[PDB]
Amino acid sequence: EWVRKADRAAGPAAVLAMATANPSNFYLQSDFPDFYFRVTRSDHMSDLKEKFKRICKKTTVRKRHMILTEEILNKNPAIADYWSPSLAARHDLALANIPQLGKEAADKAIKEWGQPKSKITHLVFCTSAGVLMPGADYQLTMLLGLNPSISRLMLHNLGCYAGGTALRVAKDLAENNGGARVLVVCSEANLLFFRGPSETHIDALITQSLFADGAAALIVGSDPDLQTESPLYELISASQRILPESEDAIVGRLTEAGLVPYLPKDIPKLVSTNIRSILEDALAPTGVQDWNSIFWIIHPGMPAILDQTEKLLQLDKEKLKATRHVLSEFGNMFSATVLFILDQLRKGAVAEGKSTTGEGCEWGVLFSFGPGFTVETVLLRSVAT
Amino acid sequence: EWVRKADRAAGPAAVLAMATANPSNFYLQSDFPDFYFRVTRSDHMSDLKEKFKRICKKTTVRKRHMILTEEILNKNPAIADYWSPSLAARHDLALANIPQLGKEAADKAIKEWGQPKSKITHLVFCTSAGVLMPGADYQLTMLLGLNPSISRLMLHNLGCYAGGTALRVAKDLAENNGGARVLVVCSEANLLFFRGPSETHIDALITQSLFADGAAALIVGSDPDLQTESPLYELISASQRILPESEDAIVGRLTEAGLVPYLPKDIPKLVSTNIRSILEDALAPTGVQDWNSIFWIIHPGMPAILDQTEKLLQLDKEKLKATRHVLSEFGNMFSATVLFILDQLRKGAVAEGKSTTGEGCEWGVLFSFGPGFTVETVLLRSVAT
């Protein structure tokens, strides 16, 4: 069967531009334990400091960018406390930083896109760094001077899987509206999760070794004008799933002291048990049987999950090179991380001179996860270079 | 031009079922000032009590349903304080009430729909009553036993306009996915806004006279099976807009004591200045020139806006009957209110025996507003009864 266009778009949603941004301030992971235990004014609990240095090394993280400097923490000592009333102070930092960080990435993505920002018709904006009313989707619309009649979707506090959510949402917006151009911005920071240490709570300590700050911006649209627009990826399918027997695996309670995490269940084992059937469900319409003929983007929120997935599917240990690079160079930037990885993978494909934006492969899978236990899966199709 | 279906849907998104729910506990507005100033243990500030009784009368509200009973407030005295650390306690109440309230409305809407809940493929869930990780979208999916692979969109703290946002989102989900059935649930409560009085802050006092609790649930899908499904409305267009010169008109800061509002600009004057051009922009593809030949749903967050819009467009004073009924009987239930009004309008059209679900008219406009200053506009088309 066939129907007229009317107002809808013909082809699948395509990623037409991507860019990233980070706060200028960064910390090297080798220096972080000394800095962390100093500024949280917690040098005495030396056994925990030794635990943190062991934890920090096995993250395989090299540096992380952070809004929170020593001076800012000194002007907001409640943030450095393990648990003190500090939500308003964190949200004042989110208001001064999160939309601005999203604008730095968006400006670069619009620069690569090359079209007037007046053609942007939708904005999807995700952050777990601060609940603002009006949201950072509004603040960005004002800072960027986007059209006042843009269709916005503000996604607060979905957690680490919201990178895939943002693509899943943009896919339906672009494909159902002719001429629609969707600005996608995940702007993330540890502003709600940062806190001092306590031997009573080690879940919080592990999160202090990984979470970092950064923004990723994308332009998504269907039916590209192939003269002025150059697609990088095609969004072919996008799905969400709650894993069986995963109740309360990842829980973040928003309190007077910010976001406090809770992680009872063994997350690597949940992913390992379910990863294969999810992936071959996503690959079902492609005709791919060898898992090494596709490109890969896995949310590196737990580095062990990269290792066990690599060995379980017997991946070529260069398949996750882009994923491990972003992890090492930036840490876990919440929902932005998998879009950082999509960008690094694109740049490395161009750099090393492969035939496709997907490192020489045609098909690729993007896989992120978070509270639920929730998995977002996106099937991507590369573009010849 | 024409394209094949593939996986997309043919026709416009239609509302196929709606239902509402409220907490059992309610307060009559005539009794509220005495109850409010007693339980906030603020009887001494008698001048403010007289202000509150004047404010409460001109709301035209008769009763409001509230999770917060006298006993619950007594077990959480920080909530009754004007400004005390109480976010965790409010969020514990949201976890015990908001998904459950959404399930009461959803069950009724699924009952009217008549199809197996296994055919629900998407869930859109809006609330400003509590930021939960995982969200109330997840909790509802578990309580309802919906498919683990449902595509969810959790919308936290958009404010009062999220009723139109939820329809705008559901429209693209239903129209771009063949066979998709979208459960839409706005479950709202004053859990983050309730607090005691302070003569220093009268914006907070006015909000205490209007905000109330309730949930609305809808089934939205394109291409109805006209044997087993009966459309109630068609979602023809859905747009969002930031009003000019409205910076910081409605602001809600999420603090250690919950949500505190701030309302400097004159909201009735912003709406009055812009209402007509927005409405005739929405009506542009219909061919309607007389504003009394369409049915009406206006978010009654400020009752004065109903009066000034009525007189500005010289409406028949029965056009807003459904809108004023929900206001009087339930108060301002945040994003759920305009869906309550859509339901009341449908029921009254059937009751009084009109020819269309839109009170005998063909076209109708749904109009809600919130932080931005943001306006959501939905063009609806009724169905013969």
Residue numbers in the entry:
A (entry chain A), B (entry chain A): 7 to 391
What is written in the article reporting this PDB entry?
In this work, we demonstrated that PECs in agarwood are biosynthesized from a common precursor featuring a C6–C5–C6 skeleton produced by a diarylpentanoid-producing polyketide synthase, hereafter named 2-(2-phenylethyl)chromone precursor synthase (PECPS). The last remaining candidate gene encodes a PKS (PECPS) sharing high amino acid sequence identity with the other four PKSs, as well as the highest 93% similarity with AsCHS1, and this gene maintains the Cys-His-Asn catalytic triad conserved in all known type III PKSs. Crystal structure analyses suggested that PECPS utilizes unique one-pot catalytic machinery that includes the release of a diketide-CoA intermediate, which has never been reported in other known type III PKSs.
We also constructed Asn199 mutants in which Asn was substituted with Leu199 and Phe199 to investigate the role of Asn199 in enzyme activity. Interestingly, the activities of N199L and N199F decreased by 35% and 56%, respectively, compared with that of wild type PECPS. ITC analyses indicated that the N199L mutant possessed a binding affinity of a KD value of 120.40 ± 10.78 μM with respect to 4-hydroxyphenylpropionyl-CoA, which was 6.5 times weaker than that of wild type PECPS (18.57 ± 1.37 μM). Furthermore, the N199F mutant possessed significantly lower binding affinity as compared with that of the N199L mutant (KD value is close to 1000 μM). Remarkably, the crystal structures of N199L and N199F did not indicate critical movement of the architectures around the active site, and further docking calculations for wild type PECPS complexed with 4-hydroxyphenylpropionyl-CoA predicted that the side chain of Asn199 could be essential for ligand binding via hydrogen-bond interactions, suggesting that the relatively reduced activity of the N199L and N199F mutants was due to the hydrophobicity or bulkiness caused by the substitutions of Asn199 to Leu and Phe. These observations suggested that PECPS utilizes only the main catalytic pocket to generate the final products.
